[PDB]
Design a protein around this ligand. Sequence first.
Ligand code: 7FK
Ligand code: 7FK
Lengths: 214, 214
Amino acid sequence: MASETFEFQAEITQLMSLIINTVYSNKEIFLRELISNASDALDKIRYKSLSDPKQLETEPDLFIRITPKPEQKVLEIRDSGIGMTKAELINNLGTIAKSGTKAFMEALSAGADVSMIGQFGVGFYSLFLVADRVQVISKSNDDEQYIWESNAGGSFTVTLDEVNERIGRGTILRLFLKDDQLEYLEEKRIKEVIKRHSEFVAYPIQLVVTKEVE
Amino acid sequence: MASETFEFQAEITQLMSLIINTVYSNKEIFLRELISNASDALDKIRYKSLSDPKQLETEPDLFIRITPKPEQKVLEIRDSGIGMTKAELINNLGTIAKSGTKAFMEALSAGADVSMIGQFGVGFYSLFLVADRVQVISKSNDDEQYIWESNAGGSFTVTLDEVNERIGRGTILRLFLKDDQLEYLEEKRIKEVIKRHSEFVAYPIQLVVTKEVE
Ligand SMILES: CN1CC/C=C/CCCCCCC(=O)Cc2c(Cl)c(O)cc(O)c2C1=O
Ligand SMILES: CN1CC/C=C/CCCCCCC(=O)Cc2c(Cl)c(O)cc(O)c2C1=O
């Protein structure tokens, strides 16, 4: 199909503009937030499967997978968690997506460290520390695969997905990294960031590395 | 769109049935043939770009990339070479695809080693040594992305591609490995097979490895 365009709730647009523009030092913290969200989605599908085991069959493996795509300056973070339907992507990432958004911004003004973002329920938006564009590609058992896309402007698009690999079930965050943040494409940097901030994750974290054979 | 189905030329079906069923020992040779085809397609796009440099811009990097997908028992061999349009996939892989096909089978009967397959121009079909199903996904600058699929039966299908990652330009052979050939998903096995049979390749060969972070 065509893309549909949606307006963000005003506090969300304010949160994003602030973060995409910040000179804050500790940007690496975006990866902890995206692994935590990935781990929550995997919790929800595992929890859901307790009474409905067939929900697992669209993707029996439970994992988080990180894929640097250095040639496109993209970093992907995939999970096989519960995924979001079209209406979920629309509601959860932007149109309500509310709640701690304004509390967080107020805490920032008073000097809170950008790293509390997650305790306010809005750590998804920390991706704009290292990316100036994101596509969230998601497949819920309840809906077709969709793409939600934002560039931290006041509106986002949602498009039926006829261009990306089929996710059996779950979500890919595809981060279009800023030119100064290309370090997050490097295998050593990634590992160091995960060991530091994500020690207790119930699910395997996989890193997809491309090496020339010689 | 829907799938279209096409009949193979009769000698091709005869070639495939023989190979999918052979007890021959040296199956590893399929990888040399698929890297050679990949290298030929990259030669043709490089040669073509000599007088039409813009043909490179849909994918400026020239590479061969091998991606084991152990969970699906798939091995992928990708190149960014010239790719095939729908009519090319139909003509080149099956409906004419002729020429050395019958000569090769006659040489086999007389005791030729399955490994001469490439000097008869039909080494593509060597994939059926290790796979009982293949999808060829291809994107020519001249056409949309298409999927050609065969299971060594007498007919194949060609489908407009709305399910796979976008190839900028080139071809993916997606091999659905036989249960006894899963060794070709292993990083050490692959490297050993390339060093042995593909020493002189002008293009980088990349191996995509997935490792758990601990
Ligand atoms: C958590 N859920 C599953 C759906 C989440 C439902 C609760 C509302 C969450 C609001 C924030 C959005 C979110 O966490 C979605 C998500 C993100 Cl951002 C991610 O990086 C990885 C994911 O697997 C998901 C996701 O699909
Ligand atoms: C060689 N060409 C480019 C298109 C080839 C034209 C000449 C006719 C070739 C007939 C065999 C089919 C073929 O080689 C196609 C192909 C295969 Cl099988 C492959 O494994 C990788 C590829 O990049 C190609 C391909 O697209």
